[PDB]
Coordinates of C-alpha atoms and ligand atoms in Angstrom, one line a residue:
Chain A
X9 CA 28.1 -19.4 3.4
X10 CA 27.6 -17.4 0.1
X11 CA 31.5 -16.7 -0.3
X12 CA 32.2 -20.7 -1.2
X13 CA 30.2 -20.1 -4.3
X14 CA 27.4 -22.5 -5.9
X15 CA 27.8 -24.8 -8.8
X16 CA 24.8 -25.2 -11.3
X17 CA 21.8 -23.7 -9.7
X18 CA 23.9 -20.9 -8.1
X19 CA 20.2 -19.5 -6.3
X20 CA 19.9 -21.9 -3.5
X21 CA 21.7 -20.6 -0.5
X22 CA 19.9 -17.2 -1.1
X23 CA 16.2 -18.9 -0.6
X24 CA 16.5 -21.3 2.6
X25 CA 18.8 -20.8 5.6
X26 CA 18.2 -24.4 6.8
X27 CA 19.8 -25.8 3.3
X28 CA 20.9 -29.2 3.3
X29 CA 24.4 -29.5 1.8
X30 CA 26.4 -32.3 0.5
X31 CA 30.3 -33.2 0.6
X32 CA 31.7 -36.1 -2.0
X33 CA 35.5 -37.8 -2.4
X34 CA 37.4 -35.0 -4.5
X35 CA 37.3 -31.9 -1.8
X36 CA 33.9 -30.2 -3.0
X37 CA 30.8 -28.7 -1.3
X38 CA 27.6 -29.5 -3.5
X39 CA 24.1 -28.6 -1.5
X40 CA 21.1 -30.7 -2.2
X41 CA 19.8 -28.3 -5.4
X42 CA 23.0 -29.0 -7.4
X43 CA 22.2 -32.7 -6.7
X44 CA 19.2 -33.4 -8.7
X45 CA 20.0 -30.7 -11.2
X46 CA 22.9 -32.0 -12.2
X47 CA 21.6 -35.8 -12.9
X48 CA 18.1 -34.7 -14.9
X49 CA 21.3 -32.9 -16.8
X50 CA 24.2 -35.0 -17.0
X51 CA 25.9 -37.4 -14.0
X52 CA 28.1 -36.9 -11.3
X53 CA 30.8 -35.3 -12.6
X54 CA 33.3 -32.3 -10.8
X55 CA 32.8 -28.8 -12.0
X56 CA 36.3 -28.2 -12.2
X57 CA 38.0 -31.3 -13.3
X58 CA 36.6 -34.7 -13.7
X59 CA 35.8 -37.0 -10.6
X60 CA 33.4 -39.5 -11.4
Chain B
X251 CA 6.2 1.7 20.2
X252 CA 9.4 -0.3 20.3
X253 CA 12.1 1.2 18.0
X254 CA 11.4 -1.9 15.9
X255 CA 7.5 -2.2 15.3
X256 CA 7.6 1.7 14.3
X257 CA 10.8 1.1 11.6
X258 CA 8.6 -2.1 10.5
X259 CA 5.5 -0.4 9.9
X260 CA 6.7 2.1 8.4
X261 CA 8.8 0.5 5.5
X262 CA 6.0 -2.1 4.6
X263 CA 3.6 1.0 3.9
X264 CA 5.8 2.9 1.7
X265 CA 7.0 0.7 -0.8
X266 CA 4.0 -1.9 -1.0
X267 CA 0.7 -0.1 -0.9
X268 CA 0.3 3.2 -1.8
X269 CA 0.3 6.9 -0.6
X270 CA -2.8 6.9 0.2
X271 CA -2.2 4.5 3.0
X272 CA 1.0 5.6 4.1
X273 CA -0.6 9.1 4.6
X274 CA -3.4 7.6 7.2
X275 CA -0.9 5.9 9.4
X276 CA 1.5 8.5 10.2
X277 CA -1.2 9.9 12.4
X278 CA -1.9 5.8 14.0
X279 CA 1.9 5.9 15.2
X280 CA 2.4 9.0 16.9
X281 CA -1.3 8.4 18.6
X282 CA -2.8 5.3 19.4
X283 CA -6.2 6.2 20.0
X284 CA -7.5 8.1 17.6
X285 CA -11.5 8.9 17.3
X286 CA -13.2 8.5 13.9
X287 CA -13.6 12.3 13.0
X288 CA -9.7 13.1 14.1
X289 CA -8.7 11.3 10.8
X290 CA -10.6 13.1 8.5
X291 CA -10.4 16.9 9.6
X292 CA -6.4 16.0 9.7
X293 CA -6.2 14.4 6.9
X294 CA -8.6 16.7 5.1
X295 CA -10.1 13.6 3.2
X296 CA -13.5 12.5 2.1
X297 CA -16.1 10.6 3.5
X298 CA -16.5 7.9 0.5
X299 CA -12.7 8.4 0.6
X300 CA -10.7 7.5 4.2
X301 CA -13.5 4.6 4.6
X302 CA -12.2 2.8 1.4
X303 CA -8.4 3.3 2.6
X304 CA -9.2 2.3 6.5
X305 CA -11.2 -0.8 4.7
X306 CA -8.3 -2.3 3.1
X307 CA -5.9 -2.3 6.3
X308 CA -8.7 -4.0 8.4
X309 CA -9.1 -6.4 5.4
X310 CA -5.5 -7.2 5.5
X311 CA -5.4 -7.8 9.5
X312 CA -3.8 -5.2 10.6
X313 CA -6.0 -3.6 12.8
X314 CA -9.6 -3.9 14.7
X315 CA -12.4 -1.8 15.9
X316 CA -13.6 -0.8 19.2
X317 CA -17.7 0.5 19.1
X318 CA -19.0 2.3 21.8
X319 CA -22.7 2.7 22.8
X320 CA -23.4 5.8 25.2
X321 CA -24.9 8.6 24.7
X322 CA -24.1 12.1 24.3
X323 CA -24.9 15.7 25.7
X324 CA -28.2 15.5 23.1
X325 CA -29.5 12.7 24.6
X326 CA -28.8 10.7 21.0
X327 CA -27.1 7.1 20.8
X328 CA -23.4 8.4 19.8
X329 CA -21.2 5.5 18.2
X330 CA -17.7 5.8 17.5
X331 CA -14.9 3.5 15.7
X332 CA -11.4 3.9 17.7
X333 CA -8.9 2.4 15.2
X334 CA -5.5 1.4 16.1
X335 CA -2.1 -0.4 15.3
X336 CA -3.1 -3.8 16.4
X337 CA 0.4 -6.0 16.3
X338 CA -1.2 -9.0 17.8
X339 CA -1.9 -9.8 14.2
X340 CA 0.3 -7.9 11.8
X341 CA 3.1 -10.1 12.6
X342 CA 2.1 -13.3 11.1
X343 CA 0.2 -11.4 8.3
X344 CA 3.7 -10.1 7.0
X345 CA 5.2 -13.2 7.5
X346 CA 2.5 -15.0 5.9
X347 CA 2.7 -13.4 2.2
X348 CA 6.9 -13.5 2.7
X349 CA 6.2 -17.7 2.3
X350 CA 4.1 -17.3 -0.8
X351 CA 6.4 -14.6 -2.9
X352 CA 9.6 -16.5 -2.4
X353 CA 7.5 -20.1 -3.4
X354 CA 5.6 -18.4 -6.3
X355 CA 9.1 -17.4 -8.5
X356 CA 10.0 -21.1 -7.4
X357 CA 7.2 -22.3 -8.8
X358 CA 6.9 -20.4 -12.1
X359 CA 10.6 -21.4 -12.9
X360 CA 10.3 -25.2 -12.1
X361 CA 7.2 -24.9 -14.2
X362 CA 8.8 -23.4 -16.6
X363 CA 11.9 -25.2 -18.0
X364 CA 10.4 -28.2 -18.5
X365 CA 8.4 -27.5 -22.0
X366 CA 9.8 -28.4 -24.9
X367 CA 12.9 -26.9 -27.3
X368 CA 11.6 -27.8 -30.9
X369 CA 9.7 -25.7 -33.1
X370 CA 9.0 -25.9 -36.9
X371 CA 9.2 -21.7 -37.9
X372 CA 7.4 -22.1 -41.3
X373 CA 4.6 -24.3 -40.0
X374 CA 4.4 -22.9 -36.7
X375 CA 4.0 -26.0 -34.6
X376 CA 5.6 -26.4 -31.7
X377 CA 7.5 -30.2 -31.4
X378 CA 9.0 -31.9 -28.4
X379 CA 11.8 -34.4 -27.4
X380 CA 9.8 -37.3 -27.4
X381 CA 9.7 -37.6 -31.2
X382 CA 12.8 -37.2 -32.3
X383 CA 13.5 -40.5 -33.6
X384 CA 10.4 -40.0 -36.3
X385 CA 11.3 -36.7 -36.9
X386 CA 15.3 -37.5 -38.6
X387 CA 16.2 -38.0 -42.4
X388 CA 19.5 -39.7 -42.4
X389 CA 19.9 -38.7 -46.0
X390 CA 20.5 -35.2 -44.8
X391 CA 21.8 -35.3 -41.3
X392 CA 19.0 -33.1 -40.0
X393 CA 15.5 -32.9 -39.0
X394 CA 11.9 -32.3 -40.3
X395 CA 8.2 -32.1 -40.0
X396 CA 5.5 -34.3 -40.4
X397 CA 3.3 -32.6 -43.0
X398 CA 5.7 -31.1 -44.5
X399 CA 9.7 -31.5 -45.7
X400 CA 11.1 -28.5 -43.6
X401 CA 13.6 -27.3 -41.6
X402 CA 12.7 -27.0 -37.9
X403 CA 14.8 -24.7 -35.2
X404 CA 14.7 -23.9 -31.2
X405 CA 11.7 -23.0 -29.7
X406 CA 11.4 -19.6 -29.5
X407 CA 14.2 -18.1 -26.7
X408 CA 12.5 -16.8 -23.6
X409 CA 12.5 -19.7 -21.3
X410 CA 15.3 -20.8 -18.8
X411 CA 17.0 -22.7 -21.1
X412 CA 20.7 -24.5 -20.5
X413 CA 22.2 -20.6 -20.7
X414 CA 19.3 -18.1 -19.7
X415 CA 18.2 -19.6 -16.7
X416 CA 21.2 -17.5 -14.9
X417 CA 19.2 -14.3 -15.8
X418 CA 16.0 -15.6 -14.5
X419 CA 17.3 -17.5 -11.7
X420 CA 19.7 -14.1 -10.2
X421 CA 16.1 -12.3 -9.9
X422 CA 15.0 -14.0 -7.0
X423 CA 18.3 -12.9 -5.3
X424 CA 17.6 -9.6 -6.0
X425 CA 15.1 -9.8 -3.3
X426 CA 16.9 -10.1 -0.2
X427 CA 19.5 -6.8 -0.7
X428 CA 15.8 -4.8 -0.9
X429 CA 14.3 -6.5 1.6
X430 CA 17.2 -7.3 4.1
X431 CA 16.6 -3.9 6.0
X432 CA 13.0 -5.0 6.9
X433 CA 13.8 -8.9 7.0
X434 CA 17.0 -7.9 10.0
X435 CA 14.1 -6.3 11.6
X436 CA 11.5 -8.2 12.2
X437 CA 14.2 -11.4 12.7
Chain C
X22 CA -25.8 38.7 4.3
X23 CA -24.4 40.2 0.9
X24 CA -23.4 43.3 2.4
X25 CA -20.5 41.0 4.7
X26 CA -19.7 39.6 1.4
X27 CA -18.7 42.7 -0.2
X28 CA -16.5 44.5 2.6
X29 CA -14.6 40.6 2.6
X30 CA -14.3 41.2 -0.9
X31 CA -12.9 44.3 -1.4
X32 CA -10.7 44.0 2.5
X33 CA -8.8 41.0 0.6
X34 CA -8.7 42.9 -3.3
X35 CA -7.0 46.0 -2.2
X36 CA -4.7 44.3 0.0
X37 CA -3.0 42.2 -3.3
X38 CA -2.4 45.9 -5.1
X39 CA 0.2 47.1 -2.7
X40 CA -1.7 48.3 0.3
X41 CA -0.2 46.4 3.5
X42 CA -1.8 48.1 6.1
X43 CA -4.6 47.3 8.7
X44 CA -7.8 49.0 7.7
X45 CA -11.4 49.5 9.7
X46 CA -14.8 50.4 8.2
X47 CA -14.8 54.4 7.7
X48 CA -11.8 53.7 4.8
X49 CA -14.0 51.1 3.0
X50 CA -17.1 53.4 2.7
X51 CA -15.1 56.6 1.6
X52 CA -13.0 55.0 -0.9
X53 CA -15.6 53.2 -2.8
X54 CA -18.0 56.0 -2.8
X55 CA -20.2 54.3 -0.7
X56 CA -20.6 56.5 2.5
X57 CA -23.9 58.0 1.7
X58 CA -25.7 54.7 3.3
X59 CA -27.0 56.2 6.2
X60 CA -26.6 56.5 10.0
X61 CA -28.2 53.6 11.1
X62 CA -26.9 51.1 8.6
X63 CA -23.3 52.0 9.5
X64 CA -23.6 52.1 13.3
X65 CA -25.3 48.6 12.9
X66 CA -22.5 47.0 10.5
X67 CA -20.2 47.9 13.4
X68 CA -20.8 46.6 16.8
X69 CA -22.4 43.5 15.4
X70 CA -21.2 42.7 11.8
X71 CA -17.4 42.3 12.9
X72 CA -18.3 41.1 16.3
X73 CA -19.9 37.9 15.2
X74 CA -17.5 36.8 13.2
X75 CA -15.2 34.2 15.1
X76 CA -12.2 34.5 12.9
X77 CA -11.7 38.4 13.6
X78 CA -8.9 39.8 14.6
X79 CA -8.7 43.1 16.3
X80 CA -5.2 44.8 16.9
X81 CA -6.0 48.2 18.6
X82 CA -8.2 50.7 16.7
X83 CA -8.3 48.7 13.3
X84 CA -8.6 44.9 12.0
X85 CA -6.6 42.4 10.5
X86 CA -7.1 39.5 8.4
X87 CA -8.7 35.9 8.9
X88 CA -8.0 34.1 5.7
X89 CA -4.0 34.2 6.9
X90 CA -2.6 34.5 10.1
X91 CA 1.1 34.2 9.3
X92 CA 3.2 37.3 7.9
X93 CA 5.1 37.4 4.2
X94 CA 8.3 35.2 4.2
X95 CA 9.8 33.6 1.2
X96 CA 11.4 30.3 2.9
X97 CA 8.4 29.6 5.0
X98 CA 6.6 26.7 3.3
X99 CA 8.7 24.0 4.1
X100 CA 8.9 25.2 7.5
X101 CA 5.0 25.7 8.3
X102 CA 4.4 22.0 6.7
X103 CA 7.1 20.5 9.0
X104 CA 4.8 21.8 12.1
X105 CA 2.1 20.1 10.7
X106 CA 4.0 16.6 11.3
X107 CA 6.4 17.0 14.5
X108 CA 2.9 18.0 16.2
X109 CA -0.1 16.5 14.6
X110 CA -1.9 19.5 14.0
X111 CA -3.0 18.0 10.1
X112 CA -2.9 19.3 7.0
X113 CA -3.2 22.5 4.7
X114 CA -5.4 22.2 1.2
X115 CA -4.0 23.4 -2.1
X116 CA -6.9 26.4 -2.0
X117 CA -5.4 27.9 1.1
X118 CA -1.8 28.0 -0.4
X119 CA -3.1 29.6 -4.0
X120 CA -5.0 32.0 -2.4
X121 CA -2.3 33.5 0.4
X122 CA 0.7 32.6 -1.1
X123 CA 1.2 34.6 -4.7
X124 CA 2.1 32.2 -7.5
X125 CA 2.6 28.8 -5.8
X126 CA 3.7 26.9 -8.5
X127 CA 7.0 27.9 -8.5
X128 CA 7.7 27.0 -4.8
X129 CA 6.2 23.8 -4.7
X130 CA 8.3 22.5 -7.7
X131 CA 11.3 23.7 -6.8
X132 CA 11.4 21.9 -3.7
X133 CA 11.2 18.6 -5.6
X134 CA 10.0 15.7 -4.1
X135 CA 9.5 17.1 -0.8
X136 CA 5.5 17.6 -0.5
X137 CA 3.0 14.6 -1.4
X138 CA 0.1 14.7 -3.4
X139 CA -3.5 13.6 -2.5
X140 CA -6.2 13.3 -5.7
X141 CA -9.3 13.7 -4.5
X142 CA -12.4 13.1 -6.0
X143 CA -13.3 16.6 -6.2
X144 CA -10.1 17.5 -7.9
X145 CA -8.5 18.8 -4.7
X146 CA -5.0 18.1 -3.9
X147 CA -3.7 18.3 -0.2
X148 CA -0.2 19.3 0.8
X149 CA 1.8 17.3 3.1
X150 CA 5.3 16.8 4.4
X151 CA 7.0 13.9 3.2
X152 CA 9.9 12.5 5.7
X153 CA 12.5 11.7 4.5
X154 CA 14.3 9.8 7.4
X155 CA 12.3 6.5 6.3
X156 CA 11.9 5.8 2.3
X157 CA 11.0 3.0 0.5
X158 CA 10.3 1.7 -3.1
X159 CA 10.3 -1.2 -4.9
X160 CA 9.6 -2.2 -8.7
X161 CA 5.5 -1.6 -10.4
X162 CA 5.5 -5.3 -10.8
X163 CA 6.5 -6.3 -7.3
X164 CA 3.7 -4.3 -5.7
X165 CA 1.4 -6.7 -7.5
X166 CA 2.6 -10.2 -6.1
X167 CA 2.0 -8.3 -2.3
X168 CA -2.2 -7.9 -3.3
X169 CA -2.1 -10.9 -5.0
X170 CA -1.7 -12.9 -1.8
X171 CA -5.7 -13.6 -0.1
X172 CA -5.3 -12.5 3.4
X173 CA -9.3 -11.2 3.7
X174 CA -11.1 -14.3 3.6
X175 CA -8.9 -16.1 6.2
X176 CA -8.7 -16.4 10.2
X177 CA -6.5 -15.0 12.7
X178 CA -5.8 -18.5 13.8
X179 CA -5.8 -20.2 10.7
X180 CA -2.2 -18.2 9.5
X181 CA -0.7 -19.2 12.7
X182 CA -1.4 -23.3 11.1
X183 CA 0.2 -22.3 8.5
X184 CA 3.4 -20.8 9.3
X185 CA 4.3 -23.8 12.1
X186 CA 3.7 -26.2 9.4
X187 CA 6.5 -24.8 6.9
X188 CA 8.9 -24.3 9.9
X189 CA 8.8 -20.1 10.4
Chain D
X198 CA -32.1 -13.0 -0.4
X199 CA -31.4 -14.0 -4.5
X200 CA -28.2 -14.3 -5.4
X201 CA -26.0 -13.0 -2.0
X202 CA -26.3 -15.4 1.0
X203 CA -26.1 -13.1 4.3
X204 CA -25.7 -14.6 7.9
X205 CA -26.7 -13.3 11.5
X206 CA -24.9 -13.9 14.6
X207 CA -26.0 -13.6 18.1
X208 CA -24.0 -14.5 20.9
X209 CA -25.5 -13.6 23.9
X210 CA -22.7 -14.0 26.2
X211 CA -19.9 -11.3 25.2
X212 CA -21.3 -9.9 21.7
X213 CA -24.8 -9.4 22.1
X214 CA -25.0 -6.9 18.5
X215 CA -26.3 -8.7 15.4
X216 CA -23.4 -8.6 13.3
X217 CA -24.6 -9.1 9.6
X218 CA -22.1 -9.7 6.8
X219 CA -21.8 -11.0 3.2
X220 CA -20.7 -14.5 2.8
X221 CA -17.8 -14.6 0.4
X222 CA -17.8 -17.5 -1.8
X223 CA -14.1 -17.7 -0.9
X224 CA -14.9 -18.4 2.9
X225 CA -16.9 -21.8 1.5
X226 CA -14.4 -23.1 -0.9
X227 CA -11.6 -22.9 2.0
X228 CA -14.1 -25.3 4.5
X229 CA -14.4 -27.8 2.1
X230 CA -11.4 -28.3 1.0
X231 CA -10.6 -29.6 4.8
X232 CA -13.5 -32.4 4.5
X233 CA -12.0 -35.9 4.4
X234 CA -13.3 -39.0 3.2
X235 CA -14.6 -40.0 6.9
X236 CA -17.0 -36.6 6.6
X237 CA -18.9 -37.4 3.0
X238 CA -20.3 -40.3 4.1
X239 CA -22.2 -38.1 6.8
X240 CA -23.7 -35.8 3.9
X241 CA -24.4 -38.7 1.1
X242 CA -21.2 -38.1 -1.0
X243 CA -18.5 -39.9 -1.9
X244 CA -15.2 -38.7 -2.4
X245 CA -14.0 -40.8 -5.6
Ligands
ZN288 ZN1 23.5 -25.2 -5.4
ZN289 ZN1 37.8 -31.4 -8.6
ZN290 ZN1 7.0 -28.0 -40.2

């Protein structure tokens, strides 16, 4: 669970067991924390390349 | 006592509240019923003393009282106060502040990094986001006041901005390596 | 009491010198120069002046102490504190630990951490045994969000709304 | 009795001893925070 790592936020999986997590088209794991933080931010862009 | 409702009680009375109250239970585990004056000639306390510490655990719901009316060898009306290690309420009582601790560093945080990030240091007045487009001279490339022609900077650095919201954010994880021996526990 | 006051007095005093030996009531009147009292104030300080006291010991022909029942050892604090836990049998004040065992400072800090402190409020302090098989301690600032919680002015019932609401 | 508002109970069924108590002004605040808008018009208040 906490050995996949955690994008932006990085303290989610830590506070709720019953996390709702995300999947998208380039072969990531983003949970519902990273989603919202990351648009108030910037878009939807991949933290390690660029998928759009 | 199970194994687990003795390791459980004994962890939350050590670290949270003090000595004092870690002291007067030692005696609750290993006997159950316990009169009144047993806990103050073992203890060696006071009278203005032990009521003030068995005050705050029957404030906090974690145990009762039992009065008795009889009467004694006198012929007087004798009234005594068993006290005891109640777990039909201790449970939810723990479980109850555990809701409120992890919510209350959620809620400082959230409340915290939305503010503002502009802030004039001769003037001392603290600017926001909204008015940047009054705030710009484009015959210098940066910003001002309003009063006055002068430099502005950040805001002063102590909230969970773009970088130091890692350091604040870590300390809420910090919770669950001290608290995943009496969390296991209990689950 | 004034007469039991003194022979307490000076059965304890003499002891601390370098005298360890059991001692009746003819040795007390002949070493203090007190034996001309008379014949019937010593016959009565006798058979009913150490009789009525109900922490007397008696050995065989003399008398022993009352104060202290346990002989001179040097590792024997930790050990008669541990008693006091694994059986229930209370506690020991800081008075009773001065005033058998010579120079107590020394022993208590030297253990460490071992023995707990009580403050009462008539500066008394009460010797314990802290275990050490279950220990626990968090930060000064963490102990404030636990009182900071208002569980007093509730209902049994009412936390059990609560809980099943959020989903624990 | 002042300032300090006290209550009495008697419940002569299983808890016949007067129990007498303060009334923390925390105990109030919690009750009427659970009144709706279909309880003020009982009282005479309105809740807008
Ligand atoms: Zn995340
Ligand atoms: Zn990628
Ligand atoms: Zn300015």
């Amino acid at each position: 669970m906490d050995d996949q790592g955690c994008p932006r936020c990085k303290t989610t999986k830590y506070r709720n067991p019953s996390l709702k997590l995300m999947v998208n088209v380039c072969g990531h794991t983003l949970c519902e924390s990273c989603v919202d933080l990351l648009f108030v931010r910037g878009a939807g862009n991949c933290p390690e390349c660029g998928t759009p | 006592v199970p194994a687990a409702l003795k390791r459980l009680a004994k962890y939350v009375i050590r670290g949270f509240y003090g000595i004092e109250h870690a002291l007067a239970l030692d005696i609750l585990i290993r006997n159950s019923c316990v009169k009144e004056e047993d806990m103050l000639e073992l203890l060696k306390f006071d009278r203005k003393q032990l009521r003030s510490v068995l005050n705050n655990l029957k404030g906090d719901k974690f145990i009762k009282c039992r009065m008795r009316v009889e009467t004694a060898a006198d012929g007087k009306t004798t009234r005594h106060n068993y006290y005891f290690i109640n777990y039909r309420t201790l449970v939810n009582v723990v479980k109850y502040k555990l809701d409120h601790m992890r919510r209350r560093i959620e809620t400082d945080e959230r409340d915290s990094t939305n503010r503002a990030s502009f802030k004039c240091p001769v003037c001392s007045s603290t600017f926001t986001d909204l008015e940047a487009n009054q705030l710009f001279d484009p015959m210098t490339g940066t910003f001002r006041c309003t009063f006055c022609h002068t430099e502005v900077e950040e805001d002063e650095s102590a909230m969970p901005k773009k970088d130091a919201r890692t350091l604040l954010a870590r300390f809420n994880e910090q919770i669950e390596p001290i608290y995943a021996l009496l969390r296991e526990t209990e689950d | 009491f004034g007469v039991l006051a003194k022979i307490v007095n000076y059965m304890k005093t003499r002891h601390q010198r370098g005298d360890t030996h059991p001692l009746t009531l003819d040795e007390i009147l002949d070493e203090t120069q007190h034996l001309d009292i008379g014949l019937k104030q010593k016959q009565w300080l006798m058979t009913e002046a150490l009789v009525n006291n109900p922490k007397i010991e008696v050995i065989d022909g003399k008398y022993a102490f009352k104060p202290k029942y346990n002989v001179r050892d040097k590792k024997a604090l930790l050990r008669l504190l541990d008693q006091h836990d694994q059986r229930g049998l209370g506690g020991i004040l800081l008075e009773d630990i001065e005033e058998a065992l010579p120079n107590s400072q020394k022993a208590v800090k030297a253990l460490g951490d071992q023995i707990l402190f009580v403050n009462r409020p008539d500066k008394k302090k009460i010797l314990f045994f802290n275990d050490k098989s279950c220990q626990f301690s968090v930060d000064e600032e963490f102990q404030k969000l636990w009182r900071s919680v208002t569980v007093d002015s509730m209902d049994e019932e009412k936390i059990e709304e609560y809980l099943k609401r959020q989903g624990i | 009795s002042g300032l300090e508002l006290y209550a009495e109970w008697k419940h002569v069924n299983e808890d016949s001893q007067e129990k007498k108590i303060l009334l923390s002004p925390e105990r109030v605040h919690e009750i009427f925070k659970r009144i709706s808008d279909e309880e003020c018009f009982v009282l005479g208040m309105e809740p807008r």
